């Protein structure tokens, strides 16, 4: 409780969908942008905190709350744009005669400031007397001892709470969410989004040799002509979809109504038939 850890992760792929197939997390209250639309959102600095509290105290982890753990143990600012994850941990964090392996601070002079970890343990103070803190009644120990017994119903059981501090500040991001990778459709004009590069064309197999660091490719007219597949290292070729101009051959309305169609810039395949130059 008073020694909540902080293992900041950066420059990695964060797929939050893995947390759904885990133990039931009936505390996913994302006080932020969107809990659903979360994988398609990159983050800059994500700070993952962790602590274990009781059941009736999980509602104090929201941004802005009173109580004992939200004012002297772990207080969140009213700007937290993230998610809170908690689940019942009474299956492995509750033993006979009480689990005394979780200590929570009870007596603190002032309210805890945003993002402060009070690792020190000094005896509380009093009035006109300098209590050192041996056995004094007027003074008391700041930390207490949780009694996590399986003899308690929903509310007094341990709940491992883990939050993710999404900064979302304007800066070069490092933690980007994963994106799906559909199967490649070769020799068929479609849309492609290979590493941000958008456009349409007929993806084919090229014969040029790129350098190990060169990802994209260009031509003499500043047009993406070849890009390597991010999944499998292979040189592809980007030729745009088959377009061209149409010119109608009409012998005059006063003579007849039959017309001929000329598809300029095609080989009679990307459409009597007669191929001209």
């Amino acid at each position: 409780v008073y020694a909540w850890n902080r293992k900041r992760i950066s420059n990695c792929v964060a797929d939050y969908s893995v947390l759904y197939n885990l133990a039931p997390f009936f505390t996913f209250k994302c006080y932020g942008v969107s809990p659903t639309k979360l994988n398609d959102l990159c983050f800059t600095n994500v700070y993952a905190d962790s602590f274990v509290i009781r059941g009736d105290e999980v509602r104090q982890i929201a941004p802005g709350q009173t109580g004992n753990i939200a004012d002297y143990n772990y207080k969140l600012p009213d700007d937290f744009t993230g998610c809170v994850i908690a689940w019942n941990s009474n299956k492995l964090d509750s033993k006979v005669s009480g689990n005394y392996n979780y200590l929570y601070r009870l007596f603190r002079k002032s309210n805890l400031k945003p993002f402060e970890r009070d690792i020190s343990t000094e005896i509380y103070q009093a009035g006109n007397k300098p209590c050192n803190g041996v056995a004094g009644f007027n003074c008391y120990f700041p930390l207490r001892s949780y009694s996590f017994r399986p003899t308690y119903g929903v509310g007094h059981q341990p709940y491992r709470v883990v939050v993710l501090s999404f900064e979302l500040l304007h800066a070069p991001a490092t933690v980007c969410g994963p994106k799906k990778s559909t199967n490649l459709v070769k020799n068929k004009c479609v849309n492609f989004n290979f590493n941000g590069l958008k456009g349409t064309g007929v993806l084919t197999e090229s014969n040029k040799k790129f350098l190990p660091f060169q990802q994209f490719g260009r031509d003499i007219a500043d047009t993406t002509d070849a890009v390597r597949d991010p999944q499998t290292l292979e040189i592809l070729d980007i030729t745009p979809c088959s377009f061209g101009g149409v010119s109608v051959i009409t012998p005059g309305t006063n003579t007849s109504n039959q017309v001929a169609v000329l598809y300029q810039g095609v080989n009679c395949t990307e459409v009597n038939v007669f191929q001209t130059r």
Partner: antibody, heavy 120, light 108 residues
Framework: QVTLRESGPTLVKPKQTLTLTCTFS??????????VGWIRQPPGKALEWLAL???????RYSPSLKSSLTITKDTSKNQVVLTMTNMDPVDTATYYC????????????WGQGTLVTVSS | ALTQPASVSGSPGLSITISCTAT?????????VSWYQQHPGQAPKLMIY???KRPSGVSNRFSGSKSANTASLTISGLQAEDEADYYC?????????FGGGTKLTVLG
């Protein structure tokens, strides 16, 4: 799978200290939520819990008997040892050591039983 | 502690229930309750823990529930290899009670 075997001298002198051990194999005691306990079963009676140890050196004993029940862990060789003093001719029973996998699974896998008949 | 019926009879094919009463239940909410089976001459093996669920290796004949404060073991489809003692166990405030015994006598 989990193999919980017992050992130690079944017959001993009265008013002594037993050394009933419980050699466990097939799992690691360092798992969070794990532990090995001890259950007594008198002939023609029901079960009764005596002691229980955990993965964080916590030794939980029965509230009735606390001056004699002393359990210890030897995970270095994987052999849980239980010691009890003041042996009276009422404790003659088949002892079992069962693994407590978690809070919901209360002693899923049990041992085989070692009868300790020591009265006179 | 926990009290259990002494003798329970059941016809082959029918279903019988056990009673694990409160008896000054210091267990509190009575969340976790496990039932064991001990044949004469063997070691007690777990049959059903967390009565809302069942462990692996146990057939669908074994099931349990707890309406308010009493856990019941519903055993359907009785056979000849079922006459054994059952024990309901929970977590008390200072120990782990195992309750009494329940002998099943399948006649016929």
């Amino acid at each position: 799978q989990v193999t919980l075997r017992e050992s130690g001298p079944t017959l001993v002198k009265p008013k002594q200290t037993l050394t009933l051990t419980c050699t466990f194999s097939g799992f690691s005691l360092s798992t969070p939520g794990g532990g090995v306990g001890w259950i007594r079963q008198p002939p023609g009676k029901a079960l009764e819990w005596l002691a229980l140890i955990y993965w964080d050196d916590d030794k939980r004993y029965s509230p009735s008997l606390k001056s004699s029940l002393t359990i210890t862990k030897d995970t270095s060789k994987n052999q849980v040892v239980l010691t009890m003093t003041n042996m009276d001719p009422v404790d003659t029973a088949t002892y079992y050591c069962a693994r407590l996998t978690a809070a919901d699974t209360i002693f899923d896998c049990w041992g085989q039983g070692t009868l300790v008949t020591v009265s006179s | 502690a926990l009290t259990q019926p002494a003798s329970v009879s059941g016809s082959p094919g029918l279903s019988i229930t056990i009673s694990c009463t409160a008896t000054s239940s210091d267990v509190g909410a009575y969340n976790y309750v496990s039932w064991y089976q001990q044949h004469p001459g063997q070691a007690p093996k777990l049959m059903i823990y967390d009565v809302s669920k069942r462990p692996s290796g146990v057939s669908n004949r074994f099931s349990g529930s707890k309406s308010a404060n009493t856990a019941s073991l519903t055993i359907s489809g009785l056979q000849a290899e079922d006459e054994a003692d059952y024990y309901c166990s929970s977590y008390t405030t200072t120990s782990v009670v195992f309750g009494g015994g329940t002998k099943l006598t399948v006649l016929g």
